[PDB]
Structures are given as structure tokens and as C-alpha cells.
Amino acid sequence: APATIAAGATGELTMYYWVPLAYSETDLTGAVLANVPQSKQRLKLEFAN
Amino acid sequence: ALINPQFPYAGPVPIPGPAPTETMPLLNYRVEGRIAGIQQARQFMPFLQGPHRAVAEQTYHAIGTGIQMGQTFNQPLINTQEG
Numbered sequence: 001a002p003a004t005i006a007a008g009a010t011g012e013l014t015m016y017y018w019v020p021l022a023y024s025e026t027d028l029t030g031a032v033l034a035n036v037p038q039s040k041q042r043l044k045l046e047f048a049n
Numbered sequence: 050a051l052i053n054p055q056f057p058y059a060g061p062v063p064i065p066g067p068a069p070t071e072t073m074p075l076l077n078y079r080v081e082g083r084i085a086g087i088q089q090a091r092q093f094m095p096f097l098q099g100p101h102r103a104v105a106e107q108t109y110h111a112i113g114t115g116i117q118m119g120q121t122f123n124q125p126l127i128n129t130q131e132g
Contacts, residue, residue, distance in 0.1 A: 036050055037060050 032038065 002011035022031035034041060082103050 039051065 001013040001015075005011040020030065023029045032041070089125075
């Protein structure tokens with residue numbers, strides 16, 4: 001992200017987030033079995049405005 | 050699992066599936082392996098097998114020599130008391 005965006009300028013930003021279910025790549029505590037039900041998962045995201 | 054009537058979960062993944070490939074084959078490995086370099090009987094180390102002394106005891110050799118020689122001075126005679 002640009003440190004500053006001057007008057008009249010347009011800045012381009014990139015951000016990444018990891019939403020964990022499993023604790024880590026080797027510890028599956030918290031992981032979700034989704035093969036087993038047609039019932040949908042919901043990942044709700046509210047962005048800046 | 051929950052099934053809900055009247056919207057029931059299809060009774061299978063059916064026959065409309067897209068077989069994507071026939072790449073299923075693992076070709077068996079056939080091989081001949083030879084590790085045959087001349088071996089020489091010995092390795093050099095700084096030290097192997099020693100149980101080094103942490104402290105030694107004190108150690109010694111021995112000698113004596115000489116003869117029996119002497120210069121002497123005696124007590125004077127005295128009067129005998131009793132008996």
C-alpha cells in the first residue's frame with residue numbers, strides 16, 4: 001500500500017488474510033469435515049467502505 | 050448427515066460425471082544398483098579408545114645408601130642411690 005496518496009492521485013493496494021479453521025498445516029484441531037452434508041458453509045466478509 | 054424431505058439429498062453422484070483422464074498408471078520401476086568402490090581397512094582419527102587421566106597420582110622411585118658411622122659424647126658417672 002502506498003505510504004501516502006497525494007491530492008488527485010490513485011493508489012493501488014493489496015492485502016491477504018488467512019482465515020483458519022485448522023490450527024496449522026500439521027495440527028488439524030479446528031478443521032471442518034465438509035464432505036458430509038449438502039448444508040452450506042458461510043464465509044462472511046465485510047469490507048472497508 | 051441430515052437428509053431433508055422434500056428436498057432430499059441426491060441419492061448418489063450419478064452418471065453424468067466427466068471421466069477426465071486414463072492416467073492412472075504407475076509404471077513399475079525396474080533397476081540394478083551397484084555400490085562397489087574399493088574399501089581400505091582403516092580410518093584416521095585424532096584419538097579413539099583412550100580413557101585419559103583426569104589427574105594422576107603422585108608416583109616415585111627410591112634409593113638409600115650409606116653406612117653406620119658416629120661421633121658420641123656420654124653422661125658422666127654418678128653415685129648410685131640404693132640397691
